[PDB]
Structure 1
Amino acid sequence: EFPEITEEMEKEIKNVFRNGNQDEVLSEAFRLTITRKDIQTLNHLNWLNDEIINFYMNMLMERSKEKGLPSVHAFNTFFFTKLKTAGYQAVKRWTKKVDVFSVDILLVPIHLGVHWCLAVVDFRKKNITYYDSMGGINNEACRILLQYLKQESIDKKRKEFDTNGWQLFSKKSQIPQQMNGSDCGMFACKYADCITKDRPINFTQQHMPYFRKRMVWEILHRKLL
């Protein structure tokens, strides 16, 4: 059971996959821009680009904040890769005006080569979790995030981070797995959608053509269905 894309909605979708002004701004929000060219990476089995992922992640963050949902901060795609390669100093900056400790969930999209995955800090559950639709385990990435939270706590609030009961880990194939390499960004987005709603991750690989069509639609209306 999944909201339907009416006729109607497909017409809006088909229309934007058409050839035309590549610079045409289809959606503008969150400091970001979605063009015709960004939207096209959602087409067929194209690899998503960062603008789509970031834009989507910001929609989840915007949706958090409505009543009853856990509150969410989404880090932008470059954050982790700038953190892994350069350390805390190079990213400490990125969280001015943001108290990363006042939300329930932190979303961290992880770019490893051609591949996408996701880490999630859930402060309610006191744990840090890695999701890969290929089934890769990434121990390291969780530790790197823990270590970042530490240095952020010392820096933003003058206190050490309290690791008691905190659990760092990767989901094995307890999550639906990809078949199409190019769907990795879509699994990362959809993992985050369920998680930020506290809903079980119920879909599989077969829903991916539908999810691509839907995200085009959602992005264009800035409405999550």
Structure 2
Amino acid sequence: GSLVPELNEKDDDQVQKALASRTQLMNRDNIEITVRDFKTLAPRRWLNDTIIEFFMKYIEKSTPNTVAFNSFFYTNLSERGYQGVRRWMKRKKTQIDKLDKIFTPINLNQSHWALGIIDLKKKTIGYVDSLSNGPNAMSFAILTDLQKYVMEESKHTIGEDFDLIHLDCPQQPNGYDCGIYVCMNTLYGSADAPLDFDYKDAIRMRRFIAHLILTDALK
């Protein structure tokens, strides 16, 4: 009972084959994944938005009272404020007051992948970064924006007294696995597990997402 499973020989081979066609692999929940996107899961590649979006949607479907927005959520919120994201929640067929958590993947400066976690139960908003400098101006803004989102989306019933925290997490050994670590932090958060994974667990994530894609995991 760990969270990211080890693939069996048939499933791992299905991944190798799809990675070698270096073709559409999936079109569900309005996410088309090609071999092109699938290959960003290949060893040492930058995970693209589409893979992030797949994984968010998988977390949503596999976690009660949980929303996990795609990377474009935070970009619209940042650039346009609450008004630019005002229908996003309703499109999820739920109300913010009925949630345990909201996950927001954050693409800082086209490259750096980080995570926001709004815990409605714990009444915290966390910034989780695997290539973390400590608190900075960007992390403060994220936290501030995510707080404004809670306050707005809830018609000002909740969020104003949330703890704005910088949540420690496992630090990546390299400068390209941000994406996978966001995914690792999301899965672990969604299970209320401590962020105590290591780099070997992160490499298995790559194979896992690839498996979920190939086995049409979004039902």
TM, length-normalised to structure 2 = 0.88
2:6 matched to 1:7?
A: no
- Deviation, 1:74, is 1.0
Q: What are the within-5 Å matches in structure 2 for residues 186-225 of structure 1?
A: 186-223=180-217
- Deviation, 1:34, is 1.2
Query: 1:157 maps to which residue?
Result: none
Aligned residues: 209
* Cα pair 2:103 2:115 within 8 Å, conserved: yes
Match of 1:74 among 57, 64, 68: 68
Mapped to 2, the partners of 1:166 and 1:90 lie a distance apart of: 23
Query: What letter is aligned with 1:100?
Result: I
Mapped to 1, the partners of 2:114 and 2:20 lie a distance apart of: 29
Match of 2:178 among 181, 184, 194: 184
Mapped to 2, the partners of 1:106 and 1:169 lie a distance apart of: 15
Mapped to 2, the partners of 1:193 and 1:177 lie a distance apart of: 16
Mapped to 1, the partners of 2:214 and 2:173 lie a distance apart of: 27
Across the aligned residues of Structure 1 and Structure 2, the Cα RMSD in angstroms comes to 1.8
Query: 1:130 maps to which residue?
Result: 127
Query: What letter is aligned with 2:130?
Result: S
Mapped to 2, the partners of 1:191 and 1:78 lie a distance apart of: 18
Query: What letter is aligned with 1:7?
Result: E
Mapped to 1, the partners of 2:123 and 2:216 lie a distance apart of: 31
Identical pairs, percent: 32
Task: Give the match's secondary structure for 1:162.
Answer: coil
Mapped to 1, the partners of 2:214 and 2:100 lie a distance apart of: 27
Mapped to 1, the partners of 2:49 and 2:85 lie a distance apart of: 18
Match of 2:105 among 90, 109, 132: 109
Mapped to 2, the partners of 1:51 and 1:39 lie a distance apart of: 9
Consecutive unaligned residues of structure 1, counting only runs of 5 or more, are 66-70, 155-159
Instruction: Tell me which moved more, 78-87 or 134-143.
Output: 134-143
Query: 1:17 maps to which residue?
Result: 19
* Cα pair 1:27 1:35 within 8 Å, conserved: yes
TM, length-normalised to structure 1 = 0.86
Query: What letter is aligned with 2:146?
Result: L
2:32 matched to 1:30?
A: no
Mapped to 1, the partners of 2:160 and 2:213 lie a distance apart of: 39
Query: 2:141 maps to which residue?
Result: 140
